[PDB]
């Protein structure tokens, strides 16, 4: 559950960085995708990454 949705459940980090066991829904799968590609990034890389992705982020948030 750290790598991929195993039997319909998957691990996503909390606000604080604590692992939580959530159903691998589109919403939670978005969450896990953002943990890998956004929330891990350092604060000197975060904001220039968001503005670069702005389109893709808004389409997923609105959709999923």
PQR file with spaces between the fields and no chain letter, atoms N, CA, C, O and H, PARSE charges and radii, in Angstrom:
ATOM       1  N    UNK     1       0.844   -1.243    0.000 -0.4000 1.5000
ATOM       2  CA   UNK     1       0.000    0.000    0.000 -0.0000 2.0000
ATOM       3  C    UNK     1       0.866    1.276    0.000  0.5500 1.7000
ATOM       4  O    UNK     1       0.316    2.372   -0.102 -0.5500 1.4000
ATOM       5  N    UNK     2       2.189    1.169    0.110 -0.4000 1.5000
ATOM       6  CA   UNK     2       3.112    2.323   -0.016 -0.0000 2.0000
ATOM       7  C    UNK     2       3.390    2.615   -1.493  0.5500 1.7000
ATOM       8  O    UNK     2       3.645    3.764   -1.854 -0.5500 1.4000
ATOM       9  H    UNK     2       2.636    0.279    0.192  0.4000 1.0000
ATOM      10  N    UNK     3       3.344    1.589   -2.351 -0.4000 1.5000
ATOM      11  CA   UNK     3       3.725    1.683   -3.788 -0.0000 2.0000
ATOM      12  C    UNK     3       2.477    1.942   -4.641  0.5500 1.7000
ATOM      13  O    UNK     3       2.424    2.934   -5.368 -0.5500 1.4000
ATOM      14  H    UNK     3       3.136    0.656   -2.057  0.4000 1.0000
ATOM      15  N    UNK     4       1.481    1.064   -4.559 -0.4000 1.5000
ATOM      16  CA   UNK     4       0.291    1.113   -5.441 -0.0000 2.0000
ATOM      17  C    UNK     4      -0.926    0.627   -4.668  0.5500 1.7000
ATOM      18  O    UNK     4      -0.768   -0.018   -3.632 -0.5500 1.4000
ATOM      19  H    UNK     4       1.524    0.258   -3.968  0.4000 1.0000
ATOM      20  N    UNK     5      -2.163    0.923   -5.148 -0.4000 1.5000
ATOM      21  CA   UNK     5      -3.394    0.391   -4.552 -0.0000 2.0000
ATOM      22  C    UNK     5      -3.477   -1.143   -4.580  0.5500 1.7000
ATOM      23  O    UNK     5      -3.736   -1.746   -5.621 -0.5500 1.4000
ATOM      24  H    UNK     5      -2.292    1.448   -5.990  0.4000 1.0000
ATOM      25  N    UNK     6      -3.251   -1.750   -3.417 -0.4000 1.5000
ATOM      26  CA   UNK     6      -3.196   -3.218   -3.214 -0.0000 2.0000
ATOM      27  C    UNK     6      -4.530   -3.627   -2.575  0.5500 1.7000
ATOM      28  O    UNK     6      -4.741   -3.423   -1.379 -0.5500 1.4000
ATOM      29  H    UNK     6      -3.040   -1.260   -2.571  0.4000 1.0000
ATOM      30  N    UNK     7      -5.423   -4.203   -3.382 -0.4000 1.5000
ATOM      31  CA   UNK     7      -6.739   -4.700   -2.944 -0.0000 2.0000
ATOM      32  C    UNK     7      -7.736   -3.580   -2.702  0.5500 1.7000
ATOM      33  O    UNK     7      -8.713   -3.775   -1.979 -0.5500 1.4000
ATOM      34  H    UNK     7      -5.252   -4.368   -4.353  0.4000 1.0000
ATOM      35  N    UNK     8      -7.510   -2.397   -3.298 -0.4000 1.5000
ATOM      36  CA   UNK     8      -8.439   -1.243   -3.282 -0.0000 2.0000
ATOM      37  C    UNK     8      -8.128   -0.219   -2.199  0.5500 1.7000
ATOM      38  O    UNK     8      -8.840    0.778   -2.077 -0.5500 1.4000
ATOM      39  H    UNK     8      -6.717   -2.239   -3.886  0.4000 1.0000
ATOM      40  N    UNK     9      -7.077   -0.444   -1.409 -0.4000 1.5000
ATOM      41  CA   UNK     9      -6.607    0.495   -0.355 -0.0000 2.0000
ATOM      42  C    UNK     9      -5.159    0.859   -0.663  0.5500 1.7000
ATOM      43  O    UNK     9      -4.416    0.065   -1.241 -0.5500 1.4000
ATOM      44  H    UNK     9      -6.498   -1.254   -1.508  0.4000 1.0000
ATOM      45  N    UNK    10      -4.767    2.073   -0.267 -0.4000 1.5000
ATOM      46  CA   UNK    10      -3.454    2.704   -0.570 -0.0000 2.0000
ATOM      47  C    UNK    10      -3.094    3.675    0.567  0.5500 1.7000
ATOM      48  O    UNK    10      -3.975    4.258    1.198 -0.5500 1.4000
ATOM      49  H    UNK    10      -5.370    2.718    0.203  0.4000 1.0000
ATOM      50  N    UNK    11      -1.800    3.834    0.813 -0.4000 1.5000
ATOM      51  CA   UNK    11      -1.237    4.700    1.873 -0.0000 2.0000
ATOM      52  C    UNK    11      -1.001    6.086    1.287  0.5500 1.7000
ATOM      53  O    UNK    11      -0.375    6.213    0.235 -0.5500 1.4000
ATOM      54  H    UNK    11      -1.084    3.360    0.301  0.4000 1.0000
ATOM      55  N    UNK    12      -1.495    7.124    1.956 -0.4000 1.5000
ATOM      56  CA   UNK    12      -1.217    8.545    1.599 -0.0000 2.0000
ATOM      57  C    UNK    12      -0.722    9.267    2.847  0.5500 1.7000
ATOM      58  O    UNK    12      -1.219    9.007    3.943 -0.5500 1.4000
ATOM      59  H    UNK    12      -2.004    7.020    2.811  0.4000 1.0000
ATOM      60  N    UNK    13       0.249   10.169    2.701 -0.4000 1.5000
ATOM      61  CA   UNK    13       0.792   10.946    3.844 -0.0000 2.0000
ATOM      62  C    UNK    13      -0.284   11.950    4.260  0.5500 1.7000
ATOM      63  O    UNK    13      -1.056   12.421    3.426 -0.5500 1.4000
ATOM      64  H    UNK    13       0.652   10.380    1.811  0.4000 1.0000
ATOM      65  N    UNK    14      -0.329   12.273    5.552 -0.4000 1.5000
ATOM      66  CA   UNK    14      -1.259   13.253    6.173 -0.0000 2.0000
ATOM      67  C    UNK    14      -0.771   14.670    5.865  0.5500 1.7000
ATOM      68  O    UNK    14       0.055   14.867    4.973 -0.5500 1.4000
ATOM      69  H    UNK    14       0.299   11.890    6.229  0.4000 1.0000
ATOM      70  N    UNK    15      -1.285   15.653    6.607 -0.4000 1.5000
ATOM      71  CA   UNK    15      -0.772   17.050    6.633 -0.0000 2.0000
ATOM      72  C    UNK    15       0.665   17.006    7.169  0.5500 1.7000
ATOM      73  O    UNK    15       1.574   17.590    6.579 -0.5500 1.4000
ATOM      74  H    UNK    15      -1.956   15.493    7.331  0.4000 1.0000
ATOM      75  N    UNK    16       0.854   16.308    8.292 -0.4000 1.5000
ATOM      76  CA   UNK    16       2.102   16.297    9.098 -0.0000 2.0000
ATOM      77  C    UNK    16       3.157   15.377    8.455  0.5500 1.7000
ATOM      78  O    UNK    16       4.340   15.511    8.770 -0.5500 1.4000
ATOM      79  H    UNK    16       0.115   15.834    8.771  0.4000 1.0000
ATOM      80  N    UNK    17       2.768   14.452    7.569 -0.4000 1.5000
ATOM      81  CA   UNK    17       3.666   13.444    6.963 -0.0000 2.0000
ATOM      82  C    UNK    17       3.506   12.050    7.571  0.5500 1.7000
ATOM      83  O    UNK    17       4.368   11.192    7.381 -0.5500 1.4000
ATOM      84  H    UNK    17       1.807   14.344    7.314  0.4000 1.0000
ATOM      85  N    UNK    18       2.401   11.814    8.306 -0.4000 1.5000
ATOM      86  CA   UNK    18       2.008   10.514    8.930 -0.0000 2.0000
ATOM      87  C    UNK    18       1.306    9.658    7.878  0.5500 1.7000
ATOM      88  O    UNK    18       0.426   10.174    7.189 -0.5500 1.4000
ATOM      89  H    UNK    18       1.701   12.511    8.461  0.4000 1.0000
ATOM      90  N    UNK    19       1.651    8.365    7.716 -0.4000 1.5000
ATOM      91  CA   UNK    19       0.936    7.497    6.782 -0.0000 2.0000
ATOM      92  C    UNK    19      -0.473    7.143    7.281  0.5500 1.7000
ATOM      93  O    UNK    19      -0.671    6.843    8.459 -0.5500 1.4000
ATOM      94  H    UNK    19       2.366    7.946    8.275  0.4000 1.0000
ATOM      95  N    UNK    20      -1.445    7.186    6.363 -0.4000 1.5000
ATOM      96  CA   UNK    20      -2.891    6.879    6.591 -0.0000 2.0000
ATOM      97  C    UNK    20      -3.340    5.860    5.544  0.5500 1.7000
ATOM      98  O    UNK    20      -2.905    5.922    4.395 -0.5500 1.4000
ATOM      99  H    UNK    20      -1.285    7.430    5.406  0.4000 1.0000
ATOM     100  N    UNK    21      -4.205    4.926    5.932 -0.4000 1.5000
ATOM     101  CA   UNK    21      -4.680    3.869    5.019 -0.0000 2.0000
ATOM     102  C    UNK    21      -6.039    4.293    4.484  0.5500 1.7000
ATOM     103  O    UNK    21      -7.027    4.221    5.215 -0.5500 1.4000
ATOM     104  H    UNK    21      -4.559    4.876    6.866  0.4000 1.0000
ATOM     105  N    UNK    22      -6.121    4.737    3.223 -0.4000 1.5000
ATOM     106  CA   UNK    22      -7.388    5.224    2.599 -0.0000 2.0000
ATOM     107  C    UNK    22      -7.716    4.401    1.360  0.5500 1.7000
ATOM     108  O    UNK    22      -6.819    3.882    0.696 -0.5500 1.4000
ATOM     109  H    UNK    22      -5.318    4.795    2.629  0.4000 1.0000
ATOM     110  N    UNK    23      -9.005    4.284    1.052 -0.4000 1.5000
ATOM     111  CA   UNK    23      -9.521    3.592   -0.161 -0.0000 2.0000
ATOM     112  C    UNK    23      -8.953    4.319   -1.379  0.5500 1.7000
ATOM     113  O    UNK    23      -9.061    5.542   -1.469 -0.5500 1.4000
ATOM     114  H    UNK    23      -9.734    4.705    1.591  0.4000 1.0000
ATOM     115  N    UNK    24      -8.352    3.584   -2.318 -0.4000 1.5000
ATOM     116  CA   UNK    24      -7.725    4.125   -3.549 -0.0000 2.0000
ATOM     117  C    UNK    24      -8.824    4.603   -4.505  0.5500 1.7000
ATOM     118  O    UNK    24      -9.050    4.022   -5.567 -0.5500 1.4000
ATOM     119  H    UNK    24      -8.265    2.591   -2.245  0.4000 1.0000
ATOM     120  N    UNK    25      -9.497    5.680   -4.090 -0.4000 1.5000
ATOM     121  CA   UNK    25     -10.487    6.463   -4.868 -0.0000 2.0000
ATOM     122  C    UNK    25      -9.714    7.413   -5.789  0.5500 1.7000
ATOM     123  O    UNK    25      -8.510    7.598   -5.608 -0.5500 1.4000
ATOM     124  H    UNK    25      -9.314    6.151   -3.227  0.4000 1.0000
ATOM     125  N    UNK    26     -10.384    8.014   -6.768 -0.4000 1.5000
ATOM     126  CA   UNK    26      -9.762    9.010   -7.677 -0.0000 2.0000
ATOM     127  C    UNK    26      -9.181   10.155   -6.834  0.5500 1.7000
ATOM     128  O    UNK    26      -8.057   10.596   -7.074 -0.5500 1.4000
ATOM     129  H    UNK    26     -11.362    7.864   -6.915  0.4000 1.0000
ATOM     130  N    UNK    27      -9.953   10.633   -5.848 -0.4000 1.5000
ATOM     131  CA   UNK    27      -9.555   11.712   -4.926 -0.0000 2.0000
ATOM     132  C    UNK    27      -8.269   11.371   -4.206  0.5500 1.7000
ATOM     133  O    UNK    27      -7.300   12.127   -4.271 -0.5500 1.4000
ATOM     134  H    UNK    27     -10.866   10.275   -5.653  0.4000 1.0000
ATOM     135  N    UNK    28      -8.252   10.236   -3.518 -0.4000 1.5000
ATOM     136  CA   UNK    28      -7.073    9.735   -2.752 -0.0000 2.0000
ATOM     137  C    UNK    28      -5.932    9.469   -3.737  0.5500 1.7000
ATOM     138  O    UNK    28      -4.776    9.728   -3.403 -0.5500 1.4000
ATOM     139  H    UNK    28      -9.039    9.622   -3.465  0.4000 1.0000
ATOM     140  N    UNK    29      -6.218    8.960   -4.937 -0.4000 1.5000
ATOM     141  CA   UNK    29      -5.148    8.681   -5.931 -0.0000 2.0000
ATOM     142  C    UNK    29      -4.541   10.004   -6.405  0.5500 1.7000
ATOM     143  O    UNK    29      -3.338   10.077   -6.653 -0.5500 1.4000
ATOM     144  H    UNK    29      -7.157    8.749   -5.209  0.4000 1.0000
ATOM     145  N    UNK    30      -5.362   11.046   -6.532 -0.4000 1.5000
ATOM     146  CA   UNK    30      -4.850   12.412   -6.780 -0.0000 2.0000
ATOM     147  C    UNK    30      -3.892   12.748   -5.643  0.5500 1.7000
ATOM     148  O    UNK    30      -2.744   13.122   -5.882 -0.5500 1.4000
ATOM     149  H    UNK    30      -6.340   10.987   -6.331  0.4000 1.0000
ATOM     150  N    UNK    31      -4.366   12.615   -4.406 -0.4000 1.5000
ATOM     151  CA   UNK    31      -3.610   12.950   -3.170 -0.0000 2.0000
ATOM     152  C    UNK    31      -2.230   12.292   -3.255  0.5500 1.7000
ATOM     153  O    UNK    31      -1.214   12.979   -3.151 -0.5500 1.4000
ATOM     154  H    UNK    31      -5.299   12.312   -4.212  0.4000 1.0000
ATOM     155  N    UNK    32      -2.185   10.978   -3.442 -0.4000 1.5000
ATOM     156  CA   UNK    32      -0.914   10.220   -3.522 -0.0000 2.0000
ATOM     157  C    UNK    32      -0.039   10.776   -4.655  0.5500 1.7000
ATOM     158  O    UNK    32       1.171   10.918   -4.478 -0.5500 1.4000
ATOM     159  H    UNK    32      -3.011   10.420   -3.527  0.4000 1.0000
ATOM     160  N    UNK    33      -0.631   11.091   -5.813 -0.4000 1.5000
ATOM     161  CA   UNK    33       0.099   11.684   -6.966 -0.0000 2.0000
ATOM     162  C    UNK    33       0.723   13.024   -6.552  0.5500 1.7000
ATOM     163  O    UNK    33       1.864   13.295   -6.929 -0.5500 1.4000
ATOM     164  H    UNK    33      -1.614   10.975   -5.956  0.4000 1.0000
ATOM     165  N    UNK    34       0.019   13.868   -5.793 -0.4000 1.5000
ATOM     166  CA   UNK    34       0.531   15.204   -5.379 -0.0000 2.0000
ATOM     167  C    UNK    34       1.644   15.034   -4.336  0.5500 1.7000
ATOM     168  O    UNK    34       2.600   15.810   -4.337 -0.5500 1.4000
ATOM     169  H    UNK    34      -0.907   13.648   -5.487  0.4000 1.0000
ATOM     170  N    UNK    35       1.541   14.041   -3.453 -0.4000 1.5000
ATOM     171  CA   UNK    35       2.593   13.715   -2.451 -0.0000 2.0000
ATOM     172  C    UNK    35       3.914   13.419   -3.168  0.5500 1.7000
ATOM     173  O    UNK    35       4.966   13.918   -2.766 -0.5500 1.4000
ATOM     174  H    UNK    35       0.764   13.411   -3.452  0.4000 1.0000
ATOM     175  N    UNK    36       3.860   12.608   -4.228 -0.4000 1.5000
ATOM     176  CA   UNK    36       5.035   12.191   -5.044 -0.0000 2.0000
ATOM     177  C    UNK    36       5.654   13.399   -5.779  0.5500 1.7000
ATOM     178  O    UNK    36       6.879   13.518   -5.819 -0.5500 1.4000
ATOM     179  H    UNK    36       3.006   12.203   -4.555  0.4000 1.0000
ATOM     180  N    UNK    37       4.836   14.292   -6.359 -0.4000 1.5000
ATOM     181  CA   UNK    37       5.247   15.288   -7.394 -0.0000 2.0000
ATOM     182  C    UNK    37       5.183   16.740   -6.897  0.5500 1.7000
ATOM     183  O    UNK    37       5.811   17.605   -7.507 -0.5500 1.4000
ATOM     184  H    UNK    37       3.842   14.195   -6.326  0.4000 1.0000
ATOM     185  N    UNK    38       4.447   17.046   -5.812 -0.4000 1.5000
ATOM     186  CA   UNK    38       4.250   18.446   -5.310 -0.0000 2.0000
ATOM     187  C    UNK    38       4.718   18.590   -3.858  0.5500 1.7000
ATOM     188  O    UNK    38       5.710   19.275   -3.611 -0.5500 1.4000
ATOM     189  H    UNK    38       3.937   16.344   -5.315  0.4000 1.0000
ATOM     190  N    UNK    39       4.040   17.970   -2.897 -0.4000 1.5000
ATOM     191  CA   UNK    39       4.178   18.312   -1.453 -0.0000 2.0000
ATOM     192  C    UNK    39       5.571   17.935   -0.909  0.5500 1.7000
ATOM     193  O    UNK    39       6.035   18.529    0.065 -0.5500 1.4000
ATOM     194  H    UNK    39       3.234   17.413   -3.097  0.4000 1.0000
ATOM     195  N    UNK    40       6.232   16.959   -1.532 -0.4000 1.5000
ATOM     196  CA   UNK    40       7.625   16.555   -1.206 -0.0000 2.0000
ATOM     197  C    UNK    40       8.615   17.668   -1.590  0.5500 1.7000
ATOM     198  O    UNK    40       9.652   17.798   -0.939 -0.5500 1.4000
ATOM     199  H    UNK    40       5.855   16.476   -2.323  0.4000 1.0000
ATOM     200  N    UNK    41       8.330   18.472   -2.626 -0.4000 1.5000
ATOM     201  CA   UNK    41       9.292   19.467   -3.182 -0.0000 2.0000
ATOM     202  C    UNK    41       9.704   20.456   -2.093  0.5500 1.7000
ATOM     203  O    UNK    41       8.899   20.775   -1.218 -0.5500 1.4000
ATOM     204  H    UNK    41       7.488   18.366   -3.155  0.4000 1.0000
ATOM     205  N    UNK    42      10.966   20.955   -2.131 -0.4000 1.5000
ATOM     206  CA   UNK    42      11.400   22.032   -1.232 -0.0000 2.0000
ATOM     207  C    UNK    42      10.767   23.402   -1.544  0.5500 1.7000
ATOM     208  O    UNK    42      10.371   23.653   -2.682 -0.5500 1.4000
ATOM     209  H    UNK    42      11.621   20.696   -2.841  0.4000 1.0000
ATOM     210  N    UNK    43      10.672   24.285   -0.540 -0.4000 1.5000
ATOM     211  CA   UNK    43       9.900   25.568   -0.582 -0.0000 2.0000
ATOM     212  C    UNK    43      10.507   26.570   -1.578  0.5500 1.7000
ATOM     213  O    UNK    43       9.837   27.529   -1.961 -0.5500 1.4000
ATOM     214  H    UNK    43      10.994   24.081    0.385  0.4000 1.0000
ATOM     215  N    UNK    44      11.760   26.364   -2.002 -0.4000 1.5000
ATOM     216  CA   UNK    44      12.431   27.132   -3.089 -0.0000 2.0000
ATOM     217  C    UNK    44      12.047   26.578   -4.473  0.5500 1.7000
ATOM     218  O    UNK    44      12.307   27.231   -5.484 -0.5500 1.4000
ATOM     219  H    UNK    44      12.304   25.585   -1.691  0.4000 1.0000
ATOM     220  N    UNK    45      11.436   25.391   -4.531 -0.4000 1.5000
ATOM     221  CA   UNK    45      10.972   24.748   -5.786 -0.0000 2.0000
ATOM     222  C    UNK    45       9.435   24.692   -5.837  0.5500 1.7000
ATOM     223  O    UNK    45       8.877   24.621   -6.933 -0.5500 1.4000
ATOM     224  H    UNK    45      11.224   24.861   -3.709  0.4000 1.0000
ATOM     225  N    UNK    46       8.732   24.721   -4.696 -0.4000 1.5000
ATOM     226  CA   UNK    46       7.261   24.482   -4.616 -0.0000 2.0000
ATOM     227  C    UNK    46       6.517   25.447   -5.541  0.5500 1.7000
ATOM     228  O    UNK    46       5.849   25.010   -6.478 -0.5500 1.4000
ATOM     229  H    UNK    46       9.185   24.779   -3.806  0.4000 1.0000
ATOM     230  N    UNK    47       6.625   26.756   -5.286 -0.4000 1.5000
ATOM     231  CA   UNK    47       5.734   27.796   -5.885 -0.0000 2.0000
ATOM     232  C    UNK    47       6.002   27.938   -7.387  0.5500 1.7000
ATOM     233  O    UNK    47       5.036   28.033   -8.144 -0.5500 1.4000
ATOM     234  H    UNK    47       7.167   27.111   -4.525  0.4000 1.0000
ATOM     235  N    UNK    48       7.264   27.957   -7.870 -0.4000 1.5000
ATOM     236  CA   UNK    48       7.522   27.883   -9.311 -0.0000 2.0000
ATOM     237  C    UNK    48       7.063   26.589  -10.003  0.5500 1.7000
ATOM     238  O    UNK    48       6.849   26.592  -11.216 -0.5500 1.4000
ATOM     239  H    UNK    48       8.049   27.879   -7.255  0.4000 1.0000
ATOM     240  N    UNK    49       6.907   25.488   -9.260 -0.4000 1.5000
ATOM     241  CA   UNK    49       6.373   24.210   -9.798 -0.0000 2.0000
ATOM     242  C    UNK    49       4.861   24.340   -9.976  0.5500 1.7000
ATOM     243  O    UNK    49       4.335   24.007  -11.038 -0.5500 1.4000
ATOM     244  H    UNK    49       7.081   25.485   -8.276  0.4000 1.0000
ATOM     245  N    UNK    50       4.156   24.823   -8.947 -0.4000 1.5000
ATOM     246  CA   UNK    50       2.673   24.986   -8.963 -0.0000 2.0000
ATOM     247  C    UNK    50       2.275   25.842  -10.171  0.5500 1.7000
ATOM     248  O    UNK    50       1.445   25.421  -10.977 -0.5500 1.4000
ATOM     249  H    UNK    50       4.584   25.094   -8.084  0.4000 1.0000
ATOM     250  N    UNK    51       2.860   27.038  -10.303 -0.4000 1.5000
ATOM     251  CA   UNK    51       2.503   28.004  -11.377 -0.0000 2.0000
ATOM     252  C    UNK    51       2.733   27.327  -12.733  0.5500 1.7000
ATOM     253  O    UNK    51       1.956   27.546  -13.663 -0.5500 1.4000
ATOM     254  H    UNK    51       3.534   27.380   -9.648  0.4000 1.0000
ATOM     255  N    UNK    52       3.785   26.511  -12.861 -0.4000 1.5000
ATOM     256  CA   UNK    52       4.147   25.777  -14.101 -0.0000 2.0000
ATOM     257  C    UNK    52       3.071   24.733  -14.428  0.5500 1.7000
ATOM     258  O    UNK    52       2.750   24.525  -15.598 -0.5500 1.4000
ATOM     259  H    UNK    52       4.416   26.334  -12.105  0.4000 1.0000
ATOM     260  N    UNK    53       2.514   24.077  -13.401 -0.4000 1.5000
ATOM     261  CA   UNK    53       1.529   22.966  -13.529 -0.0000 2.0000
ATOM     262  C    UNK    53       0.087   23.496  -13.470  0.5500 1.7000
ATOM     263  O    UNK    53      -0.847   22.757  -13.780 -0.5500 1.4000
ATOM     264  H    UNK    53       2.775   24.246  -12.451  0.4000 1.0000
ATOM     265  N    UNK    54      -0.106   24.767  -13.077 -0.4000 1.5000
ATOM     266  CA   UNK    54      -1.401   25.410  -12.700 -0.0000 2.0000
ATOM     267  C    UNK    54      -2.581   24.808  -13.464  0.5500 1.7000
ATOM     268  O    UNK    54      -3.587   24.445  -12.855 -0.5500 1.4000
ATOM     269  H    UNK    54       0.653   25.368  -12.825  0.4000 1.0000
ATOM     270  N    UNK    55      -2.469   24.699  -14.786 -0.4000 1.5000
ATOM     271  CA   UNK    55      -3.529   24.134  -15.666 -0.0000 2.0000
ATOM     272  C    UNK    55      -3.877   22.714  -15.195  0.5500 1.7000
ATOM     273  O    UNK    55      -5.035   22.425  -14.896 -0.5500 1.4000
ATOM     274  H    UNK    55      -1.651   24.994  -15.280  0.4000 1.0000
ATOM     275  N    UNK    56      -2.873   21.833  -15.133 -0.4000 1.5000
ATOM     276  CA   UNK    56      -3.022   20.381  -14.856 -0.0000 2.0000
ATOM     277  C    UNK    56      -3.617   20.153  -13.467  0.5500 1.7000
ATOM     278  O    UNK    56      -4.525   19.337  -13.307 -0.5500 1.4000
ATOM     279  H    UNK    56      -1.932   22.068  -15.376  0.4000 1.0000
ATOM     280  N    UNK    57      -3.111   20.868  -12.465 -0.4000 1.5000
ATOM     281  CA   UNK    57      -3.620   20.831  -11.062 -0.0000 2.0000
ATOM     282  C    UNK    57      -5.115   21.191  -11.044  0.5500 1.7000
ATOM     283  O    UNK    57      -5.903   20.461  -10.443 -0.5500 1.4000
ATOM     284  H    UNK    57      -2.374   21.531  -12.594  0.4000 1.0000
ATOM     285  N    UNK    58      -5.522   22.290  -11.682 -0.4000 1.5000
ATOM     286  CA   UNK    58      -6.922   22.804  -11.609 -0.0000 2.0000
ATOM     287  C    UNK    58      -7.860   21.788  -12.273  0.5500 1.7000
ATOM     288  O    UNK    58      -8.948   21.529  -11.758 -0.5500 1.4000
ATOM     289  H    UNK    58      -4.882   22.883  -12.170  0.4000 1.0000
ATOM     290  N    UNK    59      -7.453   21.215  -13.404 -0.4000 1.5000
ATOM     291  CA   UNK    59      -8.240   20.210  -14.161 -0.0000 2.0000
ATOM     292  C    UNK    59      -8.482   18.953  -13.311  0.5500 1.7000
ATOM     293  O    UNK    59      -9.583   18.405  -13.341 -0.5500 1.4000
ATOM     294  H    UNK    59      -6.570   21.426  -13.822  0.4000 1.0000
ATOM     295  N    UNK    60      -7.478   18.486  -12.553 -0.4000 1.5000
ATOM     296  CA   UNK    60      -7.566   17.286  -11.665 -0.0000 2.0000
ATOM     297  C    UNK    60      -8.446   17.605  -10.440  0.5500 1.7000
ATOM     298  O    UNK    60      -9.376   16.853  -10.147 -0.5500 1.4000
ATOM     299  H    UNK    60      -6.583   18.931  -12.529  0.4000 1.0000
ATOM     300  N    UNK    61      -8.169   18.705   -9.725 -0.4000 1.5000
ATOM     301  CA   UNK    61      -8.944   19.164   -8.537 -0.0000 2.0000
ATOM     302  C    UNK    61     -10.420   19.293   -8.903  0.5500 1.7000
ATOM     303  O    UNK    61     -11.272   18.758   -8.194 -0.5500 1.4000
ATOM     304  H    UNK    61      -7.414   19.316   -9.963  0.4000 1.0000
ATOM     305  N    UNK    62     -10.742   19.990   -9.993 -0.4000 1.5000
ATOM     306  CA   UNK    62     -12.142   20.157  -10.455 -0.0000 2.0000
ATOM     307  C    UNK    62     -12.743   18.806  -10.844  0.5500 1.7000
ATOM     308  O    UNK    62     -13.911   18.548  -10.555 -0.5500 1.4000
ATOM     309  H    UNK    62     -10.050   20.425  -10.569  0.4000 1.0000
ATOM     310  N    UNK    63     -11.962   17.943  -11.495 -0.4000 1.5000
ATOM     311  CA   UNK    63     -12.448   16.657  -12.036 -0.0000 2.0000
ATOM     312  C    UNK    63     -12.580   15.638  -10.901  0.5500 1.7000
ATOM     313  O    UNK    63     -13.619   14.989  -10.783 -0.5500 1.4000
ATOM     314  H    UNK    63     -11.013   18.153  -11.730  0.4000 1.0000
ATOM     315  N    UNK    64     -11.548   15.486  -10.064 -0.4000 1.5000
ATOM     316  CA   UNK    64     -11.308   14.214   -9.333 -0.0000 2.0000
ATOM     317  C    UNK    64     -11.356   14.377   -7.815  0.5500 1.7000
ATOM     318  O    UNK    64     -11.174   13.404   -7.084 -0.5500 1.4000
ATOM     319  H    UNK    64     -10.704   16.014  -10.160  0.4000 1.0000
